[PDB]
Design a protein around this nucleic acid. Structure first.
Ligand SMILES: [Zn+2]
Ligand SMILES: [Zn+2]
Lengths: 392, 35, 40, 227, 76, 54, 61, 91, 82, 110, 55, 97
RNA sequence: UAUUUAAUUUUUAUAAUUAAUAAGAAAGAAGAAUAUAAUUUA
RNA sequence: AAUAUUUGUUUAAUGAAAAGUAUUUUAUUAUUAUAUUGUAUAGUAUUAUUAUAGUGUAUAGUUUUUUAAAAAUAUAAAAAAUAAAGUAUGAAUUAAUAUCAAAAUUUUAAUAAAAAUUAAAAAAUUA
């Protein structure tokens, strides 16, 4: 009888005639009330014993009270919002000031040195980004600030963007104004697409392909001139080729090829587009298509060293059901390590997605297999559904 | 006993000797002498 | 649909759908440049 | 017991493995519903010691259907929960398997395990399906959408047709899920499960139906697209 | 310390993978059957690091394949 | 067998921390105001609490 | 009244379960006539891998 | 098992396996005498379907009822008229 | 060409509301005690969600007093002596 | 199959997102520090026969996880295949050696 | 249990081969040439390629 | 005769010739199912070829045998063929007297 | 549960110079499971 | 205590007044009746072994029970059925102790895991 404390959390054995207590199911412990009672708090509305008085005050102060704003006030608020032009000027300026003073990496011998972190850079770039409407990789930026060459390009192209935005206006904001109420890409926009291409190009060196491919999208978002279009489309092809998006590579790949009539004779762009369209065919395993394409490239562009390389490579390499089954490149190994099915979780035997809610695999709307609830459904008192004698 | 000589078995190789054939052989030698 | 397509791609001289459409749109754009140089 | 249906479940090598059940009766009942279900849709994902057992039994059903005999039929009909499936077996499998004698079912050990318990999951199919009449171009890599919908078909294979009498049965059994009392059954099942409580089962106010008329009219659309 | 990750052990001898060499898999396959899938001619019990071929191992009644140098991508 | 795990003694014995008298921390008026976690060497970027609604 | 309710209720459910059944058997026999129809053109014997001579023997049937 | 139609009492027989257990007491079937789907009841138990190894197959013995029913039909008296045609072991 | 309980009733002159109430438990139609699952019972509106009435989420299982009166409880004027 | 390992997976993945958000490099990341210390706790009634009871304690722990960048690292190759995979793939018609295709570096002239 | 056990008693279990085996051990794995997922040899994917050629 | 692997040896013919007189009543016209390694499936495929008789199976051209055991699929067919080839003549001899 | 015995630590090419009365890459099924180390097989 | 327990793969619990707790948002006549009032899950500390009892009735199958060897325990026929490596959950008796206390001999105020002597007890896991 009674080998432990008389508190009703206490460790050891109790008795009902000596230390009587009412029945509490899950009652939060001496410290922290933890994950389980909290689950109850957020679904059931209180702790499962019903003893505890629900106290929501502190989260009410945090959500509903904060958003309260009266009509008279919020009717006038959008009149005082900061002016976007001045914003771009400021964000560009201090972003640049912050990148210029980022130290040059000391090159050691026998071991690689850690690049000094960009803590302070993330603050200006975050505002610059959303002033502009484009998201930039922190990774790519770091890789850019490693290489001397890339840091140079990035720096001065930034500087030009700064200058053209201060003396002139912001052309995407013009082209936004004239849109809801046609001309070649402006100087500032050129500056922009150039710096973004540079940061994506650094974003490749570090080996984040998905991110480089994502960044060049916003890059072509700004180029209204045919040649910039060709180049950027090609670059997106090569970035989505490494990232193992073959459909996007085989799309953006051929745009650069389509643009060849209106693009100047000095462009390598369209040739690149051909290359990407071809390779994107090759990784999906149809080599006849590939060879056809490279044949067309050397048809139009005669001697071309890239298309020469792919001519010789396809030449060297020389079933519908087994096509693109193979994993050939590493980035989809990298993407296969996350987002994979493991033993014990994140497979079809654990939890399943239905319309953005989680179900046990027991009741899975896509599967009537053994143990599924839908096996026991019965005939619902209407008609006989199947000829099964025993079960159903 | 976990040793090798004792654990390993020759089952897989039995097709090398014709057990059925020899059994029938000594059944022939069973009826020849009249058992 | 398998032999349907095996008929499709061999009517087009061993092209595929995308190569056909690509050729086509390419021609339409080169003839847009033609309309351009004839108008200007 | 050497007869190619009636089974002996031991752990000795003469016998096919005894997977855990309540009583050899219960065991036999389980075997019967695994066979029934595997004959119905060709693959069965099955955990534990059941899987080899299920393969061997499958091979036995195909062997029977090959025998093509009245006593054979009637022996298979004793064994199955579904009479119609006996017919589907004896119609299909003889054309299917005419060129092979041995090992008609393919067992495949899956790299994922039930989270419920550590037991391993196996994928048991009938072998070559390109001679199969009603299973011809199907792809089981992923499931279908709503589980009462006819399963996926490989892209090259879209326009295939199936035995009329099978799709009749299938549509009949399908049509009871487009009804409203099934939707009520669905909500109420959520409620029941919650009371017993299994975690991650949404409250019945959030449970929106498996079947609507819009989803339907596009489903029928692509169903006649596959036809 | 350098990261503790094991190098590739796939091609060394393993006692549980060694069981599957002479096991009969006809039911595990459908289109693609190969003579003996797990058994690598000349190499001990399936493992590629343990290769015996074109050394003097005396095996009067069994066949032995000749030696071609393995590639780098088949070991690690 | 390849890994190395040796049992931690803090799980065997966990006496609660000394409580305050009259809510007075004896050394308040002596020591600096630096967050204790910092000087201890304890730091984080994200603190993800699973007791939150989100 | 609750006697008569209890019986009246158990009577007509017996009635409609028979409507269920009759319609079921009807549909299934339709099904089988469909199958019998379709097996002819396809040339399905459903007597197995053997030709007709085998059950013609009638030793095996 | 022995089954007889409710209304016309027509008799017939077949084995019932472990799978058909719910149908043992009442069956629905097409009755030859009164032609339509009708209801059959279980009067008497006959035999098993399956069997255990090292055990006789025919000793969950069919009742005296079923055997009387197999004497009345298929007996010396019942077969005697039909033999002028067949003598069933013959064609 | 299916069963279709409504047109099964229309043939048998059974008042279709009633025929359906033969095939669901006596609990869900007539006023009689019976097991109820607390998730059916319905919930008031939260900040994220709307309210949930058991009327809306279970139209069919709600009780029908037409039937209840015409079946189970007695009539007064049948018994009156005055 | 262990639950802990799954929890640590969620943690790893999140801190990986964070470490990429901070500008580091995915491929050269390594776990610098993993520790776990005792967290909050909930309690539960266990009713034992003859009017006895005890309190089942539902335990919960805090987990601390640090990913650090390590340039010197070289990863062991996981792209090796068992002989079986190799020649099964051969018989299927697949190439056992994956296709490399030379990709020209991204450049901007416009 | 006649007596409370000290920290050494508790640690003695982890010297065992059983304890090491169950809990702290590394799995051998490679990348599925089809799925690009990590994989132990002898277990496979529910997919039409993985089921035919099991890699 | 039954469990013999591969070739059918002459010592094994001896087994057959010996067991010929173990069974007193047999005619060269006897039904197939009395043969070594003649199964239900083996018999059936023989029958649709209109072969009921030990004489008829001893009359086979051996390129009937193979496609009977390969394209058709009766295993151990060559065993029953060989068994027949052996036994047919002593049956005729015990048939005359 | 402490001691004490008996067994085990998952093929050890091999065992006994003495005590008392022995250990090579590893875990799913040891079986691709219905006793063949594939019964021919699409 | 890496312990026991738990473990949800297939339903004739038909019926249910006597429970004295459980936000029905409007649960609901169409009445033939008049006003008024009131209809669904908590007995035994539990969503317990599973209630008590009065109705009235018989084909609504009226639809939550893990698992890949063997001893010994429990049932039934030493055979048969069931249960033990396991993922997850996670109590209770007990606890003076040092990394432990093995074997023998004698003594000491009563077993003496106390002394002294001689001695020769490895770790893990299971019975
Ligand atoms: Zn009748
Ligand atoms: Zn795979």
């Amino acid at each position: 009888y009674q080998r432990g404390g008389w508190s009703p959390g206490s460790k050891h054995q109790k008795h009902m005639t000596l230390n009587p207590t009412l029945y509490l199911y899950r009652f939060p412990g001496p410290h922290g009330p933890g994950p389980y009672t909290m689950k109850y708090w957020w679904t059931l509305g209180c702790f499962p014993t019903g003893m505890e008085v629900p106290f929501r005050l502190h989260e009410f102060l945090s959500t509903y009270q904060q958003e309260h704003v009266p009509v008279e006030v919020e009717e006038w608020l959008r009149c005082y919002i900061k002016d976007p032009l001045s914003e771009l000027v400021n964000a560009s300026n201090d972003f640049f000031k912050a990148v210029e003073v980022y130290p040059e990496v000391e090159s050691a011998r026998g071991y690689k040195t850690l690049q000094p972190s960009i803590a302070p850079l993330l603050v200006p770039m975050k505002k610059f980004e959303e002033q502009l409407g484009v998201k930039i990789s922190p990774v790519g930026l770091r890789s850019v600030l490693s290489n001397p060459v890339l840091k140079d390009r990035f720096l001065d192209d930034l500087f030009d963007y700064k200058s053209y935005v201060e003396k002139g206006g912001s052309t995407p904001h013009r082209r936004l104004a004239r849109s809801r109420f046609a001309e070649t890409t402006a100087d500032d926009e050129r500056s922009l697409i150039l710096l973004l291409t540079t940061i994506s190009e650094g974003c490749i060196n570090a080996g984040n392909y998905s991110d480089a491919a994502s960044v060049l999208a916003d890059a072509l978002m700004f180029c209204h001139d045919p040649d910039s279009q060709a180049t950027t489309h090609a670059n997106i092809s090569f970035a989505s080729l490494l990232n193992a998006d073959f459909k996007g590579a085989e799309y953006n790949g051929r745009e650069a090829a389509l643009l060849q009539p209106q693009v100047k004779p000095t462009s390598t762009a369209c040739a690149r587009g051909y290359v990407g369209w071809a390779a994107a065919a090759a990784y999906q395993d149809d080599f006849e298509k590939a060879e056809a394409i490279v044949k067309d490239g050397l048809t139009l562009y005669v001697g071309n060293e890239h298309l020469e390389k792919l001519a010789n490579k396809l030449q060297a390499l020389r079933p519908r059901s087994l096509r693109e089954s193979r994993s050939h490149l590493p980035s989809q190994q990298s993407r296969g390590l996350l987002s994979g099915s493991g033993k014990g979780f994140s497979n079809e035997f654990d939890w399943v997605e239905f319309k953005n809610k989680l179900y046990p695999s027991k009741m899975d709307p896509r599967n009537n297999e053994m143990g599924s609830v839908f096996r026991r459904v019965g005939d619902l008192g209407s008609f006989i559904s199947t000829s099964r004698s025993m079960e159903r | 006993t976990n040793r090798h000589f004792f654990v390993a078995r020759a089952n897989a190789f039995f097709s090398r000797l014709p057990i059925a054939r020899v059994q029938r052989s000594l059944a022939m030698e069973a009826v020849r002498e009249g058992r | 649909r398998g032999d349907a397509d095996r008929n499709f791609r061999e009517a087009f001289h061993g092209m595929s759908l995308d190569q056909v459409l690509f050729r086509e749109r390419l021609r339409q754009r080169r003839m847009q440049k033609q309309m351009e140089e004839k108008a200007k | 017991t050497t007869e190619p249906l009636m089974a002996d479940y031991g752990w000795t090598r003469g016998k096919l493995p005894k997977f855990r059940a309540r009583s050899p009766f219960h065991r036999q009942q389980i075997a019967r519903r695994m066979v029934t279900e595997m004959i119905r849709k060709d693959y069965c994902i099955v955990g534990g010691a059941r899987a080899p057992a299920l393969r061997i039994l499958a091979d036995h059903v195909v062997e029977l259907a090959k025998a093509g005999d009245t006593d054979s039929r009637q022996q298979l009909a004793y064994f199955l929960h579904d009479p119609l499936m006996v017919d589907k077996a004896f119609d299909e499998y003889p054309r299917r398997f005419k060129d092979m004698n041995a090992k008609y079912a393919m067992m495949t050990r899956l790299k994922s395990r039930r989270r419920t318990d550590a037991v391993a999951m196996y994928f048991v199919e009938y072998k070559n399906r390109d001679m199969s009449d009603n299973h011809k171009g199907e792809d089981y890599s992923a499931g279908p959408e709503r589980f009462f919908l006819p399963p996926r078909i490989v892209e090259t294979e879209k326009g295939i047709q199936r035995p009329p009498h099978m799709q009749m049965a299938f549509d009949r059994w399908a049509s009871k899920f487009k009804t409203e009392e099934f939707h009520h059954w669905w909500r109420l099942r959520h409620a029941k499960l919650r009371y017993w409580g299994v975690r991650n089962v949404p409250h019945p106010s959030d449970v929106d139906p498996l079947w609507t008329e819009k989803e339907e009219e596009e489903w029928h659309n692509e169903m006649l697209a596959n036809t | 310390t350098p990261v503790r990750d094991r190098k590739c052990t796939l091609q060394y001898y393993n006692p549980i993978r060694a069981r599957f060499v002479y096991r009969r898999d006809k039911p595990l396959f459908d289109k693609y059957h190969v003579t003996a899938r797990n058994l690598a001619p000349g190499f001990s019990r399936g493992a590629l690091k343990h290769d015996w071929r074109a050394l003097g191992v005396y095996t009067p009644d069994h066949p032995q394949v000749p030696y071609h140098p393995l590639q780098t991508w088949m070991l690690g | 067998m390849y890994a190395r795990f040796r049992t931690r003694s803090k799980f065997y014995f966990r006496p609660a921390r000394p409580a305050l008298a009259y809510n007075v921390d004896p050394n308040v008026m002596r020591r600096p105001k630096v967050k204790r976690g910092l000087l201890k060497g304890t730091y984080s970027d994200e603190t993800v609490d699973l007791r939150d609604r989100e | 009244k609750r006697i008569d309710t209890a019986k009246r209720m158990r009577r007509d459910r017996r009635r409609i379960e028979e409507l269920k059944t009759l319609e079921f058997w009807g549909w299934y026999m339709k099904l089988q006539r469909v199958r019998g129809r379709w097996c002819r053109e396809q040339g399905v014997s459903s007597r197995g891998v053997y030709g007709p001579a085998v059950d013609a023997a009638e030793l095996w049937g | 098992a022995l089954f007889s139609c409710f209304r016309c009492g027509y008799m017939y027989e077949f084995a019932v396996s472990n799978s058909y257990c719910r149908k043992l007491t009442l069956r629905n079937d097409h009755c030859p005498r009164c032609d339509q789907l009708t209801l059959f009841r279980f009067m008497s138990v006959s035999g098993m379907v399956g069997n255990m190894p090292f055990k006789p197959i025919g000793v969950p013995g069919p009742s005296y009822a079923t055997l009387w029913w197999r004497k009345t039909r298929e007996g010396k008296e019942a077969s005697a008229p039909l033999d002028a045609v067949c003598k069933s072991d013959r064609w | 060409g299916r069963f279709n309980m409504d047109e099964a009733a229309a043939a048998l002159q059974l008042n279709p509301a009633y025929a359906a109430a033969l095939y669901r438990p006596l609990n869900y139609t007539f006023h009689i005690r019976g097991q109820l699952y607390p998730a059916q019972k319905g919930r008031p509106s939260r900040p994220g969600s709307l309210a949930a009435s058991q009327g809306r989420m279970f139209p069919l299982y709600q009780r029908n007093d037409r039937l209840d009166k015409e079946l189970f409880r007695l009539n007064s004027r049948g018994l009156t002596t005055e | 199959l262990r639950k802990g390992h799954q929890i640590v997976f969620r943690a790893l993945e999140m801190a990986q997102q964070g470490a990429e958000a901070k500008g580091l490099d995915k491929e050269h990341l390594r776990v610098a520090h993993i520790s776990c210390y005792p967290g909050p706790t909930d309690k539960q009634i266990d009713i034992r026969s003859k009017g006895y009871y005890a309190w089942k304690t539902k335990k919960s722990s805090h987990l601390v996880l640090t990913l650090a960048e390590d340039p010197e690292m070289v990863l062991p190759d996981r792209t090796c295949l068992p002989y079986s995979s190799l020649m099964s793939m051969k018989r299927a018609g697949l190439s056992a050696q994956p296709t490399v295709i030379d990709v020209p570096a991204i450049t901007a002239d416009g | 249990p006649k007596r409370k056990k000290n920290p050494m008693q508790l640690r003695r279990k982890v010297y065992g081969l059983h304890f090491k085996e169950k809990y702290l051990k590394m799995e051998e794995w490679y990348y599925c040439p089809l799925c690009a997922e990590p994989k132990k040899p002898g277990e496979w994917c529910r997919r039409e390629d993985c089921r035919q050629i099991k890699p | 005769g039954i469990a013999t692997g591969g070739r059918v040896t002459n010592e094994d013919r001896r087994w057959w010739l010996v067991h010929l007189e173990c069974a007193p009543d047999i005619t060269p016209g006897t039904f197939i199912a009395w043969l070594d390694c003649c199964g239900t499936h083996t018999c059936k495929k023989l029958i649709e070829r209109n072969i009921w008789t030990i004489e008829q199976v001893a009359a086979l051209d051996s390129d009937q045998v193979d496609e009977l055991k390969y394209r058709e699929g009766c295993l151990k067919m060559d065993v029953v063929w060989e068994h027949a080839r052996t036994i047919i003549t002593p049956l005729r001899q015990r048939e005359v007297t």
